[PDB]
């Protein structure tokens, strides 16, 4: 943390943050969500980290170079250490990235190594080559070298993500699945795990072995698993919570802006809210069905009437403000809703749906006041505008993610936030073989367009290919884009260090501080 000259620090430097749900895991290779990553950034530190404004900055690596954007060499700081006092080395990273790549780890982010194009990743993921064949090596204890199969100019930007953070081999091997328990875990971020009560709280305490520990101000941070945005706001206003999760209650949001304007933080956020269609399950394997749902959804109603929190109606997967996005707004988005509805009704009728045999399916969402209210509204909009019947089903976060990976669903509420600020952070998740492809979308044409982006050595050609890839996704109606999120949350006046300038919202508690109040 960088405490401005003249600010008075509170005697007690403790923080309570709501985290939206119970985490899937504390193991960096078994996680894929925002709640998981929120805790991960405090416990595990990779090569690079985001600074307070989100710029890729030195993490375990103090400096790095690239040779033709294909061979990246990371110089690790000599004083990087784990919470048990042992050094963080290049060998930790070799082991960790191999474990991420190994099919037996079954990481939801195994494909992150394909996104960066680390040498031999496809064969390793497919079980054709051993994980030890991955294009990574420790040149010495403090030098980690990464070899890519093609030039990736933005490669370093990927390295702040939890999936590429180091894990302690000794603990993993000795304790297996219980390595993340407080008594067994070993961490290298600014914090260490003190307590973990499932569905109650996660308590982290400062890690004195952290290389930058002298600049850490908060001594303890608690992460709560409250999925009710109303409850989160209530416990924030009661004094228990210092920072809410960034999902706001429809019930209370308007009032909050007028009641505590200075505490309501609303900043740009590179995330897209959409309805994920299971593309491999009939009748959703029919583009006419998918297009009808996409068109019959009234974004103006949802975004400006039901939600009204500053979100922008979406027509794409990648947010248009992503660095490098030069997207073409589709013609259907410019139409009137009635015109969209007619087209939707016509396509559904074409697909074989009548009043006698209407389209009926499930709408899965993770337990939440916001998602339930949006799902009820969408169910109503689709019933009125298209004559479809929707069965709402809620599931806890971890279960919900597993269900989408399993393909045991029809339509699911979804949200994707950038891992790095570049269009492929979104587009790569729709590749036929992506470990993050929960839409179960497989398009050779889409795959080709993205493959071509690293075959050109020009940003204008790359951007045009990204625009074409979005048009392909849109023509196939892979998903139902709803809106581009805004990062809205409540932050107590005494919480210093949260600028809200980072569009990826990669917060580190080590950068925050409590002002005397």
Of 168, 199, 232, the last residue of a domain is 168
DSSP state string for 248-292: --TTTHHHHHHHSGGGEEEEEEEEEEEEEE-TTSTTTTSHHHHHH
CA-based nearest residue to 364, from 334, 320, 311, 402: 402
Give the span between the Cα atoms of 159 and 28, in whole angstroms. 13
57 DSSP β-pair partners: 49
Give the span between the Cα atoms of 163 and 31, in whole angstroms. 8
DSSP state string for 196-228: EETTTEEEEEE-TTSTTGGG----EEEEE----
- Which secondary structure element, helix H or strand E, spans residue 371, and what is its range? helix 369-386
- In this structure, are 284 and 158 located in the same domain? no
Q: E strands within 396-496?
A: 411-417, 479-490, 495-496
**279's tokens:** 């593309």
Strands 389-395 and 411-417: unpaired
- In this structure, are 126 and 143 located in the same domain? yes
**Tell me, what CATH number does 155's domain have?**
3.90.76.10
- How many domains does the chain divide into? 3
Neighbours of 495 (CB within 10 A): 20
- In this structure, are 101 and 233 located in the same domain? no
**Tell me, what CATH number does 378's domain have?**
3.10.105.10
DSSP state string for 9-38: BPSS-EEEEE-SS--S-SSTTS--SHHHHH
**Tell me, what CATH number does 216's domain have?**
3.40.190.10
- In this structure, are 211 and 332 located in the same domain? no
Of 168, 193, 228, the last residue of a domain is 168
- In this structure, are 301 and 419 located in the same domain? yes
- CA 451 distance to own-chain centroid: 22
CA-based nearest residue to 273, from 370, 397, 361, 362: 370
Cβ proximity of 278 and 409 under 8 Å: yes
Structural domain of residue 109, as residue ranges? 45-168
- In this structure, are 422 and 501 located in the same domain? no
Sign of CA dihedral 497, 48, 432, 398: negative
CA dihedral 28, 29, 30, 34 (to 10 degrees): 50
- Resolution (angstroms) stands at 1.2
> Distance between the two ends of the chain, CA-based, in angstroms?
18
Of 138, 168, 198, the last residue of a domain is 168
Give the span between the Cα atoms of 263 and 266, in whole angstroms. 10
- In this structure, are 458 and 344 located in the same domain? yes
- In this structure, are 481 and 491 located in the same domain? no
Output the furthest CA–CA distance in the chain (Å, rounded): 72
């Amino acid at each position: 943390a960088d405490v401005p000259a003249g600010v008075q620090l509170a005697d007690k430097q403790t923080l309570v943050r709501n985290n939206g749900s119970e985490v899937q895991s504390l193991d960096p290779h078994k996680i894929e969500g925002v709640p998981e990553s929120n805790v991960s950034r405090d416990l595990f530190e990779g090569l690079l980290i985001s600074d307070v404004e989100g710029h890729p900055s030195p993490g375990v690596a103090e400096k790095w170079e690239n040779k033709d954007f294909k061979v990246w060499t990371f110089h690790l700081r000599e004083n990087a250490k784990w919470s048990d006092g042992t050094p963080v080395t290049a060998h930790d990273f070799v082991y960790s990235w191999q474990r991420l790549a190994d099919p037996n780890t079954a990481s939801p982010y195994a494909s992150y190594l394909q996104y960066g194009h680390i040498a031999n990743i496809d064969d390793i993921i497919a079980g054709k080559k051993p994980a030890t064949d991955l294009g990574v090596k420790a040149l010495d204890d403090h030098t980690f070298e990464v070899t890519l199969s093609e030039p990736v100019p933005y490669f370093y930007k990927l390295l702040v993500h939890p999936s590429v953070s180091p894990v302690p081999k000794s603990a993993v091997e000795k304790f297996g699945d219980k390595w993340t328990q407080p008594a067994n875990i070993v961490t290298n971020g600014a914090y260490k795990l003190k307590n973990w009560v499932v569905n109650e709280r996660i308590v982290l305490e400062r890690n004195p072995q952290y290389w930058d520990n002298a600049k850490t101000v908060i001594n303890q941070v608690t992460y709560l698993p409250i999925s009710s945005e109303v409850t989160d706001v209530n416990r924030y206003r009661s004094g228990e919570i210092d920072m809410t999760y960034n999902n706001m209650p429809i019930e209370l949001f308007q009032k909050l802006k007028k009641e505590i304007p200075n505490e309501v933080r609303v900043d740009p956020y590179l995330c897209t809210y959409y309805y994920e269609i299971n593309n491999q399950k009939a009748p959703f394997n029919d583009v006419r069905v998918r297009t009808a749902l996409k068109l019959a959804l009234d974004r103006d109603i949802i975004v400006n009437k039901v939600k009204n929190q500053g979100d922008l109606p979406a027509y794409s997967y990648t947010p248009p403000y992503t660095d490098g996005a030069k997207l073409v707004e589709p013609e259907w988005f410019k139409w009137s809703q009635q015109k969209r509805n007619e087209e939707a009704k016509k396509l559904l009728a074409e697909a074989g749906f009548t009043a006698d045999k209407p389209l009926t399916f499930d709408l899965l969402y993770n337990t939440s006041d916001l998602h339930k209210k949006l799902a009820i509204a969408v169910a109503s909009i689709w019933k009125k505008n298209l004559g479809v019947n929707v069965n709402l089903e809620n599931q806890e976060w971890k279960t919900f993610l597993d269900t989408r990976h399993q393909g045991t669903f029809d339509v699911a509420r979804a949200g994707w936030c950038a891992d790095y600020n570049e269009p492929t952070s979104f587009l790569n998740t729709m590749l036929s073989d992506s470990s993050n492809n929960t839409a179960h979308y497989k398009s050779p044409a889409f795959d080709k367009l993205i493959a071509d982006t690293l075959k050109v050595a020009d940003d204008t050609q790359r951007s045009e290919l990204y625009a074409k890839a979005e048009q392909q996704l849109d023509k196939d109606s892979a998903i139902v884009p709803v809106y581009y999120y805004v990062n809205a949350r409540l932050v107590k006046p005494w919480v210093g260090g949260y600028t809200g300038k980072d569009p990826l919202d990669n917060i580190y508690v080590k950068n925050l501080y409590i002002i005397k109040h």
